[PDB]
Design goal:
The structure is a homodimer. The first copy, chain A, is an alpha/beta fold and about 210 residues long. Helices cover about 45% and strands about 15% of the residues of chain A. Chain A has a single domain, classed as 3-Layer(aba) Sandwich (Rossmann fold). A 5-stranded parallel sheet of chain A has the order 2-3-1-4-5, sandwiched between helices. Chain A is globular and about 45 Å long. One adenosine-5'-diphosphate binds next to α1 and α9 of chain B.
């Protein structure tokens, strides 16, 4: 028996838009209602690949557009095992950033070619739902530690914001106004996650 | 002015089939007839990525099929700059292994999905010609240091040999019997490379 028992939820969004904050809250909420959950995020900067992705973002190095893109996708693929497993077991996975981030950022910030960009992530496990913490490009420039990494320039974030729309109208995509109080965002999130039916199912894969 | 002045030639083939030997010879031959040439090979195991690709082959680590595949492609992309440059300048590039190796090996040894496999290498510079040093899967098991790396098992090489055929009938593909004396292989190679017209041209990209 291999059906998919856990639930896989992804947060997406501009930089400094509260992805962590909201993923932590969703996690603790679920912990509270007795649902085993594992928090992951992407990129995972601890693996070999991650380490390279990391220097790239911190501008400790440079690499061509297509290399870093590929590196990002690879990084997700090295977690498909863990994820299938948790999900097989009934552990929900709350993830922050996934392939959506890949296409969005590469195609927006590095003028890559949307189909080209999706291609390598194609076949990755599809999540049950994506929460897009929607915020205006200039909004987050105020937050905590903005500007400390390669893509954290208003002009660039404006470019990215437009590419996120490439999923904006997709059934699993759930826009969320993220310019509000933390607990307002949190509650919308919960209301939507309760709508969910649990029930073992079959896995689905990007980009269906 | 950006037209492509050098010539780009790729050697392909099973393991221990004399790719190096023949690339060295072609290089020295060209050096002899006053043609600037830069020898490269793939994977390049010196870069960040390379280092990971390396442990993989030496079985010092493991990674999922799709990760290593992606890592291989990425590795080629980090050389598109160097290569375009040499070629722009009129430096010929003799390369040993390219995308053909990628599709061939991943799809054969790791049952990946041919289109999936080609997708990430799509857009890489197309070479002028591929010399496929054709040898039977059991032939090379005798050579120098066979078996010291992950794919060097007759049963696996048999699997790969069949996937190389995925280009076998392509105009740029040039089969070469490689079960012969070194200098016979060398001469066929030269005869074919002389056929070439030099003449600045436009670049072409896989997978056209
Ligand atoms: N709704 C909010 N209102 C005010 N500050 C916030 C809000 N959400 C996040 N922050 C703050 O902004 C910074 C970025 O939040 P974070 O969740 O780390 O963003 P992301 O994970 O999307 O990069 C943090 O210091 C956090 O405390
Ligand atoms: N035509 C040949 N006849 C006999 N031995 C060969 C021939 N070609 C290569 N070898 C030997 O086999 C080994 C593998 O050759 P190499 O060019 O390194 O293969 P590849 O680069 O394709 O892995 C080397 O030790 C080389 O000396
Ligand atoms: C996961 C992923 C992230 N990114 C970018 C988005 C983020 N922008 N910045 N800085 C950065 C990820 O770092 P943070 O998720 O910790 O904010 O990587 C990609 O370009 N492609 C990807 O596939
Ligand atoms: C360039 C490339 C090589 N390979 C394999 C072929 C070779 N098989 N072995 N062992 C190995 C490359 O090492 P050598 O080219 O030095 O023989 O990597 C791939 O699987 N994908 C690739 O994209």
């Amino acid at each position: 028996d291999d059906k998919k028992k856990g639930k896989f939820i992804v947060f997406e969004g501009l930089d400094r838009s509260g992805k962590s904050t909201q993923s932590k809250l969703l996690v603790e909420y679920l912990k509270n209602n007795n649902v085993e959950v594992k928090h992951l995020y992407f990129p995972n900067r601890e693996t070999g690949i991650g380490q390279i992705i990391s220097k790239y973002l911190k501008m400790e190095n440079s690499m061509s557009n297509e290399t870093i893109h590929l590196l990002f996708s690879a990084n997700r693929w090295e977690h498909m095992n863990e994820i299938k497993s948790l999900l097989l077991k009934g552990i929900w996975v709350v993830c922050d950033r996934y392939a959506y981030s890949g296409v969005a950022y590469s195609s927006g910030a590095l003028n890559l070619n949307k189909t080209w960009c999706m291609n390598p992530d194609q076949g990755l496990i599809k999540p049950d739902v994506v929460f897009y913490l929607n915020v205006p490009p200039n909004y987050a420039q105020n937050r905590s530690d903005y500007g400390e990494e390669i893509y954290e320039k208003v002009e660039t974030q404006k470019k990215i914001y437009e590419t996120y729309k490439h999923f904006a109208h997709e059934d699993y995509w759930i826009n969320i106004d993220a310019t509000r109080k933390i607990e307002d965002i949190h509650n919308d999130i919960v209301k939507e996650v309760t709508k969910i039916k649990v029930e073992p199912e079959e896995f689905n894969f990007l980009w269906s």
